[PDB]
Amino acid sequence: TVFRQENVDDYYDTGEELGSGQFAVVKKCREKSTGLQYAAKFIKKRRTKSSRRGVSREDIEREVSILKEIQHPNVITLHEVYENKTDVILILELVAGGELFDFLAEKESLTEEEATEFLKQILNGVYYLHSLQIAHFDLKPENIMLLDRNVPKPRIKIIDFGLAHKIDFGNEFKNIFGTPEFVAPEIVNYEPLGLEADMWSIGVITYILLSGASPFLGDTKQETLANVSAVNYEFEDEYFSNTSALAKDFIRRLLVKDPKKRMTIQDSLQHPWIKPPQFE
Numbered sequence: 357t358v359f360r361q362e363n364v365d366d367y368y369d370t371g372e373e374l375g376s377g378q379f380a381v382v383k384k385c386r387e388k389s390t391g392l393q394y395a396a397k398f399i400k401k402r403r404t405k406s407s408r409r410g411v412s413r414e415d416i417e418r419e420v421s422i423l424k425e426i427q428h429p430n431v432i433t434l435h436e437v438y439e440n441k442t443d444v445i446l447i448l449e450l451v452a453g454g455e456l457f458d459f460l461a462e463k464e465s466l467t468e469e470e471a472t473e474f475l476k477q478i479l480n481g482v483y484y485l486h487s488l489q490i491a492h493f494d495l496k497p498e499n500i501m502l503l504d505r506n507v508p509k510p511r512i513k514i515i516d517f518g519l520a521h522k523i524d525f526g527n528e529f530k531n532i533f534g535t536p537e538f539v540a541p542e543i544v545n546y547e548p549l550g551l552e553a554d555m556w557s558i559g560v561i562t563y564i565l566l567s568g569a570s571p572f573l574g575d576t577k578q579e580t581l582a583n584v585s586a587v588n589y590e591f592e593d594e595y596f597s598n599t600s601a602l603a604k605d606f607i608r609r610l611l612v613k614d615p616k617k618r619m620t621i622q623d624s625l626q627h628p629w630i631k632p633p634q635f636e
């Protein structure tokens with residue numbers, strides 16, 4: 357599939373660079389014809405067929421196809437796609453309140469009520485994705501953005517679908533590996549992957565929201581990955597002594613090695629607490 361090949365600068369003016377990962381660049385921009393503001397994500401193309409740098413065309417096209425299908429308040433909207441010799445440029449909805457990662461760094465830890473206000477929105481977005489058989493495969497605080505960080509109950513959107521896949525045969529078995537602290541054991545073990553992997557990541561996120569600490573994090577990537585595979589975590593009393601038993605129950609039912617025994621997204625919404633790359 358080919359994208360718009362006019363110069364993006366003919367249609368948008370860019371401004372501030374926003375925070376991003378090592379591989380893409382994200383800039384605020386403004387569309388000349390409407391004055392509306394967006395975020396432009398520049399994905400570097402592969403320079404040759406057997407190259408390791410840049411993103412393969414197949415991978416870019418998968419991300420664009422998934423973005424085009426999704427429309428939900430808790431997921432980022434794709435507006436347009438441009439391309440040139442070096443980059444594919446996604447014009448995305450602007451989310452200006454920063455990363456949940458940076459919000460958490462300011463608060464240290466969240467109360468159970470504050471955590472559930474965020475978690476409900478994450479679960480609603482993941483329920484939409486899983487209903488479409490889309491696994492995100494990279495859920496973590498850096499991939500969740502706040503619309504406005506200055507309100508008492510900030511609203512959020514899931515971003516960056518660069519690892520997302522449609523799961524139409526129940527599982528995928530290929531080159532899929534996210535960030536070590538957040539990946540499920542089946543990722544660590546290079547096993548077939550399905551929607552269950554996202555549920556594990558939600559368990560990790562929930563643990564971090566309540567404690568400010570990462571449940572499997574070791575001093576090196578290999579230690580973290582070994583900890584994930586062994587389900588080596590505990591609810592440290594220093595962080596969790598005053599946390600409700602139901603919150604611990606929720607996490608415990610997500611941080612389960614066997615994907616078939618892990619809570620699904622539908623289970624998570626009915627749970628009584630809620631119901632109203634890899635190489636150093």
Ligand SMILES: c1cc(-c2cnnc(N3CCN(c4ccncc4)CC3)c2)ccn1
Nearest residue numbers: 375376377382395449450451498499515516
């Ligand atoms: C504003 C921004 C964005 C946007 C789009 N794509 N990726 C984005 N980042 C967010 C930061 N980031 C990391 C990852 C690792 N370490 C530090 C930061 C993860 C990816 C932001 C979209 C709309 N409005």
